[PDB]
Coordinates of N, CA and C and ligand atoms in Angstrom, one line a residue:
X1 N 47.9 95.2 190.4 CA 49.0 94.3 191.0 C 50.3 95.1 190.8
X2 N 50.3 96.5 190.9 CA 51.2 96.9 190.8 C 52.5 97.0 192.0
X3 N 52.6 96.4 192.9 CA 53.2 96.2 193.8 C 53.8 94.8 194.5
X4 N 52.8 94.1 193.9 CA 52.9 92.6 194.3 C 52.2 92.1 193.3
X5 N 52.8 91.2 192.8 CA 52.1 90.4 191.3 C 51.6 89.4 191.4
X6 N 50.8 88.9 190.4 CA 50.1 87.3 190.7 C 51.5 86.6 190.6
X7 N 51.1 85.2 190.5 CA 52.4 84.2 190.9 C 52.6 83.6 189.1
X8 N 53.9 83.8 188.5 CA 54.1 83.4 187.3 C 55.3 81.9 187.4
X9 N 55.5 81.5 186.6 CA 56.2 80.1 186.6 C 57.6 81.2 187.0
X10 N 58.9 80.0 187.4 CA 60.0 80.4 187.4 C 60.6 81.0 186.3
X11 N 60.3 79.9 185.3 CA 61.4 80.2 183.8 C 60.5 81.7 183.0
X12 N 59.7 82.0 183.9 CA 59.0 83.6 183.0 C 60.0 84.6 183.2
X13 N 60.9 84.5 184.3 CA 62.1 85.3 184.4 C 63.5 85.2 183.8
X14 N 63.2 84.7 183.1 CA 64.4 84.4 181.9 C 64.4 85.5 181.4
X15 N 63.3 86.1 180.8 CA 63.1 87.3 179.7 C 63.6 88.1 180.5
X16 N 64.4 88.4 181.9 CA 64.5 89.7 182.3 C 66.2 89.7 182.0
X17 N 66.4 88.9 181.6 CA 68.1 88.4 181.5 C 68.2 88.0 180.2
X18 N 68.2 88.1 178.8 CA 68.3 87.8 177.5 C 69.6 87.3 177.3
X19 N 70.0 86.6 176.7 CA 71.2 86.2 176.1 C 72.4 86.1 176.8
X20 N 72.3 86.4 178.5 CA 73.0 86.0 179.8 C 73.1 84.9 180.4
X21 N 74.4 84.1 179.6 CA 74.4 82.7 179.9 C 74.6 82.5 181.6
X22 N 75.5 83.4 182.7 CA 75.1 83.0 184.2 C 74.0 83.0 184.5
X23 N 73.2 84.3 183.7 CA 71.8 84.1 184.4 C 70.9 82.7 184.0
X24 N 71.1 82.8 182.9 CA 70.2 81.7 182.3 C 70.6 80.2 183.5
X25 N 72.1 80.1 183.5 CA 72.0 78.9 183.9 C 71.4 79.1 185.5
X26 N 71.4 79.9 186.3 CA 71.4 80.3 187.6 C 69.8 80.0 187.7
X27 N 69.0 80.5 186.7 CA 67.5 80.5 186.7 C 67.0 79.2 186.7
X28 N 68.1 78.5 185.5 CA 67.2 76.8 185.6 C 67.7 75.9 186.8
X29 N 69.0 76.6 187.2 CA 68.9 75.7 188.5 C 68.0 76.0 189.4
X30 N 67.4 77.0 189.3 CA 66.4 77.6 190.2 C 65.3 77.1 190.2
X31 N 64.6 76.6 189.1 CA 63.5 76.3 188.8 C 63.3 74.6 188.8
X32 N 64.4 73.9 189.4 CA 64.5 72.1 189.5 C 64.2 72.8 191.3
X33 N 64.1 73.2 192.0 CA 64.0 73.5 193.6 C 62.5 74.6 193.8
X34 N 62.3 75.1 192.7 CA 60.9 76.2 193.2 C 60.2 76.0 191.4
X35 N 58.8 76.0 191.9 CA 57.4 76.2 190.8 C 57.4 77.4 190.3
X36 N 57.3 78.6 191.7 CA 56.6 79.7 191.4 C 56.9 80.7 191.8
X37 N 56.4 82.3 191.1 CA 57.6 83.3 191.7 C 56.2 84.2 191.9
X38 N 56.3 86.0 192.8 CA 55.5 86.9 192.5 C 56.5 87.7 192.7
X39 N 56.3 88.9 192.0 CA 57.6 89.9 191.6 C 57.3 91.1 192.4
X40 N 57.6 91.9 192.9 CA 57.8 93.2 193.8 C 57.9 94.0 193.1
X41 N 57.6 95.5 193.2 CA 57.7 96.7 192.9 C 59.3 97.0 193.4
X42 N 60.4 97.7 192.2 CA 61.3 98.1 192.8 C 61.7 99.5 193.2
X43 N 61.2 100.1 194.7 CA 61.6 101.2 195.0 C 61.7 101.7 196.2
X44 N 62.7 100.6 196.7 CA 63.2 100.8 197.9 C 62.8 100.2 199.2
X45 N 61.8 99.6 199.0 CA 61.0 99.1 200.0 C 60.5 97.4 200.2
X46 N 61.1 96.9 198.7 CA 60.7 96.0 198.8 C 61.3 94.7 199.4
X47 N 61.7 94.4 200.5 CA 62.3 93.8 201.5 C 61.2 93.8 202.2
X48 N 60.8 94.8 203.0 CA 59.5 95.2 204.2 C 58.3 94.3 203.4
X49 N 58.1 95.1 202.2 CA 57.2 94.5 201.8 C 56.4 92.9 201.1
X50 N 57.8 92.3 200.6 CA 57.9 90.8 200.5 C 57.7 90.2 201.7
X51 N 58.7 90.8 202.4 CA 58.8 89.4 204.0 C 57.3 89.4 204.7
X52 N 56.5 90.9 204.3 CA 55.1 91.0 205.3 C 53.8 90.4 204.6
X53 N 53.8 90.4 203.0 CA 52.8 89.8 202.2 C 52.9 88.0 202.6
X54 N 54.3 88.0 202.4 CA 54.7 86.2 202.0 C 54.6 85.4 203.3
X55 N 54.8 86.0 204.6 CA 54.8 85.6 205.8 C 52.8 85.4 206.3
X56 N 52.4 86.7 206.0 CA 50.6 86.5 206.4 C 50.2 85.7 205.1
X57 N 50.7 85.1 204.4 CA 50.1 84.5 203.3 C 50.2 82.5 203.7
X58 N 51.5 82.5 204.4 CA 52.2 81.4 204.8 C 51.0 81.1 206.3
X59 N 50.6 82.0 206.9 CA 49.5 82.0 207.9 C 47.8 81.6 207.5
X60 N 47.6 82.1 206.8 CA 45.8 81.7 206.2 C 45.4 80.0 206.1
X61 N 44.7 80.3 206.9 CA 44.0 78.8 207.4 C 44.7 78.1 208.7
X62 N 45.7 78.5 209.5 CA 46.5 77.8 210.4 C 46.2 78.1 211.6
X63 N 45.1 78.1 212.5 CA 44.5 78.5 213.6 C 45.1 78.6 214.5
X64 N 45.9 77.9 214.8 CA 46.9 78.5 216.4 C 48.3 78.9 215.8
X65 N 48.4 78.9 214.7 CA 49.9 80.0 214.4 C 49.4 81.1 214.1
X66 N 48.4 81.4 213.4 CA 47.2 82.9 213.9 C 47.3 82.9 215.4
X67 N 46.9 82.6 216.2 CA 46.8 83.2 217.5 C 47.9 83.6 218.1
X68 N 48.8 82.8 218.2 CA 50.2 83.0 218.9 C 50.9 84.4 218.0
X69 N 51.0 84.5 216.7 CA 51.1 85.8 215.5 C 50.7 86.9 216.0
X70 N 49.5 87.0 216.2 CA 48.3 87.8 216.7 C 48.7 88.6 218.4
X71 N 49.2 87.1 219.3 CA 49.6 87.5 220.6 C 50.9 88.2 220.8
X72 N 52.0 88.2 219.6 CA 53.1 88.9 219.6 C 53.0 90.0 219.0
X73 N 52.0 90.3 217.7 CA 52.0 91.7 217.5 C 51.4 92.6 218.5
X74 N 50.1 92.2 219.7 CA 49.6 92.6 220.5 C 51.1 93.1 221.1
X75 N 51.8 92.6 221.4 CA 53.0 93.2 222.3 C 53.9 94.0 221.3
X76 N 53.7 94.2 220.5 CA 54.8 95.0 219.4 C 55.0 96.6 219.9
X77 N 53.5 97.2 220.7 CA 54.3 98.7 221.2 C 54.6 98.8 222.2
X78 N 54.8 98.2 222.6 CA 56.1 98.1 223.9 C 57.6 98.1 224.0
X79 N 58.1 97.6 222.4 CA 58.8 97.3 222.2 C 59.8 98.6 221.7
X80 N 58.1 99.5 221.0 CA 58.6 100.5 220.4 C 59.1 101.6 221.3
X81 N 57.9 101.6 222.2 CA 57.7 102.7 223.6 C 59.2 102.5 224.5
X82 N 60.0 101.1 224.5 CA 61.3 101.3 225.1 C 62.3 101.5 224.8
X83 N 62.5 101.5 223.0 CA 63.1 102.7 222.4 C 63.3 103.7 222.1
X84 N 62.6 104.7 222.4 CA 62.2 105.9 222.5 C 60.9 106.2 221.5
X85 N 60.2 105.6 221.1 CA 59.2 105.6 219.8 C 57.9 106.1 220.6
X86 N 57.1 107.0 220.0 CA 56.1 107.8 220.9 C 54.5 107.3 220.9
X87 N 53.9 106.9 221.1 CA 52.5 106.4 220.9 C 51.9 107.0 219.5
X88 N 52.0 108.3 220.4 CA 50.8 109.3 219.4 C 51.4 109.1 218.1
X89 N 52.7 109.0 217.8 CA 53.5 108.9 216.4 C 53.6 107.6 215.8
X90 N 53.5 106.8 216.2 CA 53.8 105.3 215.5 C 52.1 104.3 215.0
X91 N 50.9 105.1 216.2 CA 49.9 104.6 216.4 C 49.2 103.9 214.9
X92 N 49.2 105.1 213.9 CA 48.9 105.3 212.5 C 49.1 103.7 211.9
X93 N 50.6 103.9 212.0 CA 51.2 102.4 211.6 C 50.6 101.1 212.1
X94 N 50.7 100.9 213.4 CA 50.7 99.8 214.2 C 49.3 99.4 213.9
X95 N 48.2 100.4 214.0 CA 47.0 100.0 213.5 C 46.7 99.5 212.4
X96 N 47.4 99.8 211.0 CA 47.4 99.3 209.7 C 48.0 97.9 210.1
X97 N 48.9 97.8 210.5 CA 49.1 95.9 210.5 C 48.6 95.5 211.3
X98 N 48.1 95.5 212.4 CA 47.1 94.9 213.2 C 46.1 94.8 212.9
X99 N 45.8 95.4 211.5 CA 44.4 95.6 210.7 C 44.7 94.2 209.7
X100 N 45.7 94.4 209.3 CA 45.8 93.4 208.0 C 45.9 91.7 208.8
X101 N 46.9 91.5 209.6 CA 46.6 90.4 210.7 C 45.2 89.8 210.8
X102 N 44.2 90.8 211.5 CA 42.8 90.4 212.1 C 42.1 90.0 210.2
X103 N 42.9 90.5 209.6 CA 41.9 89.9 208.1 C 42.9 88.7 207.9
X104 N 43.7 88.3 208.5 CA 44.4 86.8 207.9 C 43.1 85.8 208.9
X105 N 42.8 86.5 210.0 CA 42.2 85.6 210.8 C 40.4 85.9 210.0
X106 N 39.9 86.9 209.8 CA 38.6 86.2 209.7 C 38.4 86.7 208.2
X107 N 38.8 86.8 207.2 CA 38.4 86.6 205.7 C 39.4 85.8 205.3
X108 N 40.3 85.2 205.5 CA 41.2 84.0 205.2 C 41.9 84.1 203.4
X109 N 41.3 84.8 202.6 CA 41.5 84.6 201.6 C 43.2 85.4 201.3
X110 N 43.8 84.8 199.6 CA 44.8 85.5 199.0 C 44.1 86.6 198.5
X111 N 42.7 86.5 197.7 CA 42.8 87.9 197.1 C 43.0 88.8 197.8
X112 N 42.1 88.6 199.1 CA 42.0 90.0 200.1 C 42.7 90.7 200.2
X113 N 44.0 89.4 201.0 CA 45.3 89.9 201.5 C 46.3 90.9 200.3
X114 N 46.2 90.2 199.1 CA 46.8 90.5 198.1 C 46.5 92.2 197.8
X115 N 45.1 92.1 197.3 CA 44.5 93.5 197.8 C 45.2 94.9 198.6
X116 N 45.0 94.8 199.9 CA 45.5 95.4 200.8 C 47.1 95.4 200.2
X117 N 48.1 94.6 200.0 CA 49.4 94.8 200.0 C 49.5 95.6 198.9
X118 N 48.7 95.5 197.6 CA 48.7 96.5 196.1 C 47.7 97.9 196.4
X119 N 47.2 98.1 197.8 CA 46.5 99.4 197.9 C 47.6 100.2 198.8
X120 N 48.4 101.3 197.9 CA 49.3 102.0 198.1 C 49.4 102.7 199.6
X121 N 48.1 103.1 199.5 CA 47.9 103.6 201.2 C 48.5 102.7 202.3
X122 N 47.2 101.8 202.3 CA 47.5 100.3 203.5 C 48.6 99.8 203.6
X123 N 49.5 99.4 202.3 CA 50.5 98.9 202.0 C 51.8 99.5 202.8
X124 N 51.9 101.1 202.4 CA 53.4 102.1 202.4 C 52.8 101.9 204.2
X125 N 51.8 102.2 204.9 CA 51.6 102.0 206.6 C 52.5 100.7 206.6
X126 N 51.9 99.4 206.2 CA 52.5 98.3 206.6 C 54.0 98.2 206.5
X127 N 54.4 98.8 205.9 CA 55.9 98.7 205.4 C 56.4 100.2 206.5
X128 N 56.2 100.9 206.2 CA 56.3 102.1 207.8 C 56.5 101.2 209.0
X129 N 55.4 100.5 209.3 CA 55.4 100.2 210.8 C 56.6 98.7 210.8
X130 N 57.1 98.1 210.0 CA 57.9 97.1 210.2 C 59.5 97.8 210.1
X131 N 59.4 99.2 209.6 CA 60.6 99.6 209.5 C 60.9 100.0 210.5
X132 N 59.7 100.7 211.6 CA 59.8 101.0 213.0 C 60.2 100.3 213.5
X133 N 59.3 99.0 213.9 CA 60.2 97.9 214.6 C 61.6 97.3 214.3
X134 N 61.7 96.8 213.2 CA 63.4 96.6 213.1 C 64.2 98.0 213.9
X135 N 64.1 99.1 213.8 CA 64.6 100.0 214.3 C 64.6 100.3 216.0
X136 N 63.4 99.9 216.3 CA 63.3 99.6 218.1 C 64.3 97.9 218.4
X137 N 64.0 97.2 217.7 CA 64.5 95.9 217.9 C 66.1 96.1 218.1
X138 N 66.2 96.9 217.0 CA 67.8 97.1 216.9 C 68.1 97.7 218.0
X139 N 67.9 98.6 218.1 CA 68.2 100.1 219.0 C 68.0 99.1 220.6
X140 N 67.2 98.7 221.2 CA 66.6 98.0 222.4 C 68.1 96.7 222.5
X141 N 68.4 95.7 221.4 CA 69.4 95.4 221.8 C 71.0 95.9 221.0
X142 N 71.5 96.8 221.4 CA 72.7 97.6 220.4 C 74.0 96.6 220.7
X143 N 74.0 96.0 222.2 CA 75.0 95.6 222.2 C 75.1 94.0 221.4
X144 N 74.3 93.5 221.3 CA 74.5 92.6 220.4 C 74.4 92.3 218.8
X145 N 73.8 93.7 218.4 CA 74.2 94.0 216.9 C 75.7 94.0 217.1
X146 N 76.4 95.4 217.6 CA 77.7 95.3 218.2 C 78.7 93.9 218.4
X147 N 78.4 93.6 219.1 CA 79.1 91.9 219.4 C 79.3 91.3 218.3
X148 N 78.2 90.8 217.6 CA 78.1 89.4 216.6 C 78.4 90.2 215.1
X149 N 77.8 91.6 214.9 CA 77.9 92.3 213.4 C 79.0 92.8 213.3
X150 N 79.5 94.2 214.2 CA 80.2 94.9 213.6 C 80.6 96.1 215.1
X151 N 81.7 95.8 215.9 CA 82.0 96.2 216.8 C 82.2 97.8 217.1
X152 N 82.5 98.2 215.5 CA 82.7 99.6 215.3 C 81.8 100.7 215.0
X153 N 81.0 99.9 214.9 CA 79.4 100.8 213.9 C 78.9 101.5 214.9
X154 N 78.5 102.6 214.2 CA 77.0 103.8 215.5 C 75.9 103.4 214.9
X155 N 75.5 102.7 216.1 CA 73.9 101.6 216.0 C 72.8 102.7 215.7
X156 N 72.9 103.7 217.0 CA 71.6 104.6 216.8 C 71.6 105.5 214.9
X157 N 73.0 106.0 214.6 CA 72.7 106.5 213.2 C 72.8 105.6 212.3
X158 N 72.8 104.5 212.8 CA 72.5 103.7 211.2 C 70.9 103.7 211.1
X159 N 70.2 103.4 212.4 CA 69.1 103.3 212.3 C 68.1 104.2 211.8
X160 N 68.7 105.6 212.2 CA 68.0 106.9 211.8 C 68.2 106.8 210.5
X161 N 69.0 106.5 209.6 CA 69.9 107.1 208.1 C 69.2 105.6 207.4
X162 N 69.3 104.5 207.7 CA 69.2 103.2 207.0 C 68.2 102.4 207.1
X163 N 67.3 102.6 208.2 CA 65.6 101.7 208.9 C 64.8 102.3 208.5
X164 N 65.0 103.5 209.4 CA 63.4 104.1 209.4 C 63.3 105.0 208.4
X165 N 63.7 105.7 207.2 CA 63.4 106.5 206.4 C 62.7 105.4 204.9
X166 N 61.4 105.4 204.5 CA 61.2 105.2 203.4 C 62.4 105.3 202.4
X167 N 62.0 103.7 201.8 CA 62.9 103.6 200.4 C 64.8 103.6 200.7
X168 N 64.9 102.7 201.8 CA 66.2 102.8 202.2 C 66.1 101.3 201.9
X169 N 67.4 100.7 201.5 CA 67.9 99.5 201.3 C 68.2 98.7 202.2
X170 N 68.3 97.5 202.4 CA 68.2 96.5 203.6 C 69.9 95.9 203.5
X171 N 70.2 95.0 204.6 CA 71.3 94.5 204.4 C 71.4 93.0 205.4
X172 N 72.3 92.5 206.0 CA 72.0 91.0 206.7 C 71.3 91.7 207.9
X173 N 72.1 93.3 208.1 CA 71.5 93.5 209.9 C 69.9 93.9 209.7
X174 N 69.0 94.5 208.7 CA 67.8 94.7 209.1 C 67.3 93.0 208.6
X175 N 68.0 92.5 207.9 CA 66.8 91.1 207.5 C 66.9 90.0 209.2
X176 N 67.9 90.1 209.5 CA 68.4 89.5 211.0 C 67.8 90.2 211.9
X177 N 67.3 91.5 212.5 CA 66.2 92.1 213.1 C 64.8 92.3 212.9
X178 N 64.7 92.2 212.0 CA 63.3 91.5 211.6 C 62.8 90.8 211.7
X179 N 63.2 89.5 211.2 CA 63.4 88.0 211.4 C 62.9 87.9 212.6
X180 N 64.0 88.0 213.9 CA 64.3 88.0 215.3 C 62.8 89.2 216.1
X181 N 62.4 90.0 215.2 CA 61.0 90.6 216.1 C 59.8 90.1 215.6
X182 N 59.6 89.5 215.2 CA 58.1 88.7 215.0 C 58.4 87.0 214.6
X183 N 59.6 86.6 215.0 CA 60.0 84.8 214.9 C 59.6 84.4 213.8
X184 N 59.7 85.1 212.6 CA 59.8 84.6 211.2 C 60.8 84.2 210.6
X185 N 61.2 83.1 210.2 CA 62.5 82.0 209.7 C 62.2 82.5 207.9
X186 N 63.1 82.6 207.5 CA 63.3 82.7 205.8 C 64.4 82.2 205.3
X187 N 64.2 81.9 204.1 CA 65.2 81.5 203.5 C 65.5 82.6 202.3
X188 N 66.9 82.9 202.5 CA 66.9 83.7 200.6 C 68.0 83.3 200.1
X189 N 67.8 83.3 198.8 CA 68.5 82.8 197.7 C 69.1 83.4 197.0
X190 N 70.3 83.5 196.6 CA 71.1 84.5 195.7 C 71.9 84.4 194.6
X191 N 70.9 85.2 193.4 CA 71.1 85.0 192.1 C 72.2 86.2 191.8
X192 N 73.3 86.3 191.7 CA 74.8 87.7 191.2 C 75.3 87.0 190.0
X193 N 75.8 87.9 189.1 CA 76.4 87.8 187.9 C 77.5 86.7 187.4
X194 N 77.9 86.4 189.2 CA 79.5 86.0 188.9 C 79.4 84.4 188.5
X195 N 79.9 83.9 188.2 CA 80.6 82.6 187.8 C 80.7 81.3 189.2
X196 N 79.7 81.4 189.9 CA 79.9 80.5 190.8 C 78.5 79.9 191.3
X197 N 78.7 78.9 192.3 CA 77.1 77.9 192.6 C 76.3 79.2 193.4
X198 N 74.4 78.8 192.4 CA 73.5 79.3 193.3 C 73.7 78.9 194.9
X199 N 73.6 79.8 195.4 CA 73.7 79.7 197.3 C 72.7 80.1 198.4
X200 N 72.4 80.0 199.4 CA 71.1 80.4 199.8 C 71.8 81.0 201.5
X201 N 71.2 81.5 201.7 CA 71.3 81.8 203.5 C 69.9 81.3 204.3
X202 N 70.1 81.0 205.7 CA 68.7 81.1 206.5 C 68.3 81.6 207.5
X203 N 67.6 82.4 207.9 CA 67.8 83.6 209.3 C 66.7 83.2 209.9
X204 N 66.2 82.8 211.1 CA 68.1 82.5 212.0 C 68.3 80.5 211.4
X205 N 70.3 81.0 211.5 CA 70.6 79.5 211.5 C 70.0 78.3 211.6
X206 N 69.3 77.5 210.6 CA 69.1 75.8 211.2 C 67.9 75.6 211.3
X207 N 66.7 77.3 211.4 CA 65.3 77.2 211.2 C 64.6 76.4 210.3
X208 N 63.2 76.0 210.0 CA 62.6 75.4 209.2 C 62.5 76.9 208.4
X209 N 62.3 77.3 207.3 CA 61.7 78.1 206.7 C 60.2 78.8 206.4
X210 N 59.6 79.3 206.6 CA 58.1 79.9 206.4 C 58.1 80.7 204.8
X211 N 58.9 81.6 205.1 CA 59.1 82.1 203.5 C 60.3 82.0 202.7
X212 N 60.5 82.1 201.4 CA 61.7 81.9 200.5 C 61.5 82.9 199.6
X213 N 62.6 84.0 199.9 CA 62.7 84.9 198.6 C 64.2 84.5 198.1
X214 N 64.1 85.1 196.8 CA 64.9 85.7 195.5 C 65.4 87.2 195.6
X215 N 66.6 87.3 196.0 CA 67.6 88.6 195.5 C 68.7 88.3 194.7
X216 N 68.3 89.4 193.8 CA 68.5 89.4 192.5 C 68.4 91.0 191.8
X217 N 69.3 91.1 191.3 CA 69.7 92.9 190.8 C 69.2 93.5 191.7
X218 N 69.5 93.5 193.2 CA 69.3 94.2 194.6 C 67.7 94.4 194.5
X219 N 67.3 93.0 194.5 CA 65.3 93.2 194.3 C 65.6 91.4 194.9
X220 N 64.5 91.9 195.9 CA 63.5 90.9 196.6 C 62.3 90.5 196.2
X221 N 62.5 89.2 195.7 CA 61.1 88.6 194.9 C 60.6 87.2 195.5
X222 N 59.3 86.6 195.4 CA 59.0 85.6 196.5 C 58.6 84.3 195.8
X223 N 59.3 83.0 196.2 CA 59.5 82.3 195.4 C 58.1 81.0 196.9
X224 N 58.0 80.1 195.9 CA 57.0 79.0 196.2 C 57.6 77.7 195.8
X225 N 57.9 76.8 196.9 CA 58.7 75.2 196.5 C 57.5 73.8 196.5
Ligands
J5G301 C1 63.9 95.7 197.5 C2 63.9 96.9 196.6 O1 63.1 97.8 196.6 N1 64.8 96.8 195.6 C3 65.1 97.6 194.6 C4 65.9 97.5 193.5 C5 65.7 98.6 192.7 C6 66.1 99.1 191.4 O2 64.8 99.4 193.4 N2 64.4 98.8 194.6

C-alpha cells in the first residue's frame, strides 16, 4: 500500500502535526464532517492519482453510472487525436485505464481496484494517461482557459512544462480540466497553517460531489463523509 493506503480514522493525522495548535484545531474540525481518510504517496503525482482511485471506487456496484463512465472514456481518443496527440504514442496509456474501468465493471471489488492503483506499473500509465487528457482538454478549448482563468497566459507552454511531464504539481486550472473531461464533481478541502476557518471549494460550482479530498502540505489525500 505504498501509494494508496488502507483507510485510517481522521484524528490518526494528528501525529503528522505534533504540538501545532492550527493544525490540531483544523483536524478536529475536520473530523465532526468526515470518518475516514487514505493517504497518497507524495511525489508529484498525487492529484492524478487520488481523483482516479477515489472516483472508480465512488463507481463499484452502480450499473448505469458504469455504463455511461465507460461510454465517455470510449470517446476519450478523440479528444486526444484533436489536439495534436498521436495514437501510436498515447495508446500505451489509454489502454491501462480502459483496463482498470472494465475491472470496476466486472470484478467490482476495493481490493482489486486498490491493487492495481499500488502496482507501480498500472498505476504511473493511469496517471500518464489523465495527464494527457487534462492537456488535450485544455489545449482543445484555450480560449476559455484564457477568458475565465488568466487572459495573459501561453496555454500551449503551460501544458507542455506543467500537465504532461510526470511529477508536476497541479493548480485550480488542471483540477478544473479534469473535472470538466470525464464529468467528475469533487469537493476539496483546505487545511494551511494560517489562523483562519477550514474552507472547501467544489468543481464545477453547485455540483453534488462524487469525491472529497484533503490538501494539505501541497498533498492530496481522500477523505470519506
Ligand atoms: C500531490 C502530490 O504529489 N503532492 C506532493 C507533496 C509532496 C512533498 O510531494 N508530492
Amino acid at each position: 500500500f505504498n501509494l494508496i493506503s488502507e483507510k485510517c480514522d481522521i484524528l490518526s493525522i494528528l501525529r503528522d502535526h505534533p504540538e501545532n495548535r492550527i493544525y490540531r484545531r483544523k483536524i478536529e474540525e475536520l473530523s465532526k464532517r468526515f470518518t475516514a481518510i487514505r493517504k497518497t504517496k507524495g511525489d508529484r503525482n498525487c492529484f492524478y492519482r487520488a481523483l482516479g482511485y477515489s472516483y472508480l471506487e465512488s463507481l463499484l456496484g452502480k450499473s448505469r453510472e458504469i455504463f455511461k463512465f465507460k461510454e465517455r472514456v470510449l470517446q476519450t481518443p478523440n479528444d486526444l487525436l484533436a489536439a495534436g496527440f498521436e495514437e501510436h504514442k498515447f495508446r500505451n496509456f489509454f489502454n491501462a485505464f480502459y483496463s482498470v474501468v472494465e475491472l470496476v465493471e466486472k470484478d467490482g471489488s476495493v481490493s482489486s481496484l486498490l491493487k492495481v492503483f499500488n502496482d507501480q506499473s498500472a498505476s504511473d500509465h493511469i496517471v500518464q494517461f489523465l495527464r494527457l487528457l487534462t492537456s488535450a482538454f485544455i489545449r482543445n478549448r484555450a480560449d476559455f482557459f484564457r477568458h475565465f482563468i488568466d487572459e495573459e497566459m501561453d496555454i500551449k507552454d503551460f501544458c507542455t512544462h506543467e500537465v504532461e511531464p510526470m511529477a508536476t504539481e497541479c493548480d485550480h486550472i488542471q483540477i478544473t480540466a479534469l473535472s470538466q473531461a470525464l464529468s467528475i464533481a469533487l469537493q476539496v478541502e483546505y487545511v494551511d497553517e494560517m489562523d483562519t476557518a477550514l474552507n472547501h471549494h467544489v468543481f464545477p460550482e453547485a455540483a453534488t460531489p462524487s469525491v472529497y479530498l484533503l490538501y494539505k502540505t501541497s498533498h492530496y489525500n481522500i477523505l470519506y463523509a
